[PDB]
Amino acid sequence: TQAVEAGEKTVEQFVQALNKGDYNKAAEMTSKKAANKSALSEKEILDKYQNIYGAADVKGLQISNLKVDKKDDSTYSFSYKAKMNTSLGELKDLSYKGTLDRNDGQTTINWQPNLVFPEMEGNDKVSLTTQEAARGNIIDRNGEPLATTGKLKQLGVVPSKLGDGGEKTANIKAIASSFDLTEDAINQAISQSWVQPDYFVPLKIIDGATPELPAGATIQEVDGRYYPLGEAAAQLIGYVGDITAEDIDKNPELSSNGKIGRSGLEMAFDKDLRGTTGGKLSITDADGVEKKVLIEHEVQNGKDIKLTIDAKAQKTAFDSLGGKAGSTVATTPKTGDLLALASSPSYDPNKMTNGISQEDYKAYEENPEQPFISRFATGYAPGSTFKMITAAIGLDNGTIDPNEVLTINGLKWQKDSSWGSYQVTAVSDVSQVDLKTALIYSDNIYTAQETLKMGEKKFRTGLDKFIFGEDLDLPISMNPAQISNEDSFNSDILLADTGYGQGELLINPIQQAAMYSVFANNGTLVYPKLIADKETKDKKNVIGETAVQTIVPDLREVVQDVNGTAHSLSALGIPLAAKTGTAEIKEKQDVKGKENSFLFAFNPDNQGYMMVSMLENKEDDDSATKRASELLQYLNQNYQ
């Protein structure tokens, strides 16, 4: 019994060293190379485990049902069921047998080939055949391609087959004139630090007919990942990159010869898109004759992913941002279908996946506007657009009378002198301000006063009925919205600042369209939806239906009134209920504060579409309302 317990320890330490990949440490736990003991030496056990387990990408060896007894005066037998992960999946229910040796003061494993795999004998080899699985596509709500796979021709000269003296300068002038390339551009690439005489320098990506090949040039077909919308959906869709040895060590079921999603939906849906690798892991004879198969699957290509995105709306929403920093979200507010998730500025996802230069990559990363950011999933303060929510909350708890007229003298206001150098600012100078006037002229002083009059307790009670703190069921990396940093404002300034969408509010554009959907569903919040086949989920009785029928007519006047902040949208001649907004931002790298311009708009007649757009750090004379005319035309004509 005293030695039977030590035998179970050496078996588990042997399994652990194999599981941890340290085959040398496991090999040093075996007995001497002899008959009825260890078949191979230590270094030969190391090389056999490193070759066989390395060929199959064996990882995560776990054993169970360990039983160790006694057979002779010094021979102990062990047995256990085992499972492991390979590049062909999980290899479960393995019956491993073996014997031990207790010669001196230690216990060693009488190593045999049957410990690499259950039924191995002597010079038994291990063969592994694999077939790559084609990556699935990503399509919009109408089947248009957003991320597809295709073959591309890779033109490239060979330095050794190009020439010697004079014949090199002639064959370079022909490999450049026949493919429409500047002649001075071939020498700068076939002379880089990585170039070798017998290598292949990839020149141009042919996208049509392959012309006559001069002396030195040769085509190379490569499977590529294409993005039709390009940068217009780069943040949402993401990109794929070459799979590295580190990726295979974390997940052996990947194809070391394929691609892996690095960001966006390509990474979120990497498993569904990449499929499963087909092939066969077998044991052969000493010559190569197949004995027993261990694993065998057929190749299963990845499943396509259909989104709620509109490919034409995604491109229009992105192009309307004109490369400036900002984001735009379009939904069908009654269902939650995310029609467009645009973020600007952006990066080239095709250039990102088909070989990106370190110069261009550093430009993307050092760009102060940060094109890599998915701005539709980044927490922002909603700005004075949030006056709708505060007003709706005020109408519900009986604080705000739509016909009561507050008197506001001047453009700056504060509760008293304790506020110091903080003052709520009104854009327009309007003395008599009611609820309809505050929404038309975008008056923050009215909202700040009504927020303080409402009180923090009533204000949070109405705010808590929304989606603050909730995790949206979306395949987009995202943090939940927050009202403030803590559960209590502990500040009348922060309370008033939060009233008109400033303060410590953090709500990303997707969460904004979710909260704002209550005005298109009679007070019911409809959760956003990115996957087309998913079921519509909602949250009823968020705000009172009376508040919706009181505010939406005012939001019509934000467009129709001659002094409405979105009056330029009446040029469209379409039914619009809108609400502009600005968020005052103060960052450290600048002395004067910045400003974020917002526009919320939806069709108040049919509730077919809803838009939430933002310009981050707006330039002068620029706004989100000025850039939304094109998208509103498309959404109104195609989503009724």
Automatic annotation (TrEMBL):
It is found in: Cell membrane. One of its GO terms (molecular function) is penicillin binding. This is Penicillin binding protein 5. Residues 326-626 form the Penicillin-binding protein transpeptidase domain. One of its GO terms (biological process) is response to antibiotic. Residues 8-124 form the NTF2-like N-terminal transpeptidase domain. The gene is pbp5. Belongs to the transpeptidase family. It is a single-pass membrane protein. It comes from the Bacteria. Residues 131-291 form the Penicillin-binding protein dimerisation domain. Gene3D superfamilies: DD-peptidase/beta-lactamase superfamily, NTF2-like, domain 1, Penicillin-binding protein 2a (Domain 2), Penicillin-binding protein 2a, domain 3. The lineage of its organism: Bacteria, Bacillati, Bacillota, Bacilli, Lactobacillales. One of its GO terms (cellular component) is plasma membrane. Keywords: Membrane, Transmembrane, Transmembrane helix. Its main location: membrane. It comes from Enterococcus faecium. It holds the Pfam family Transpeptidase.
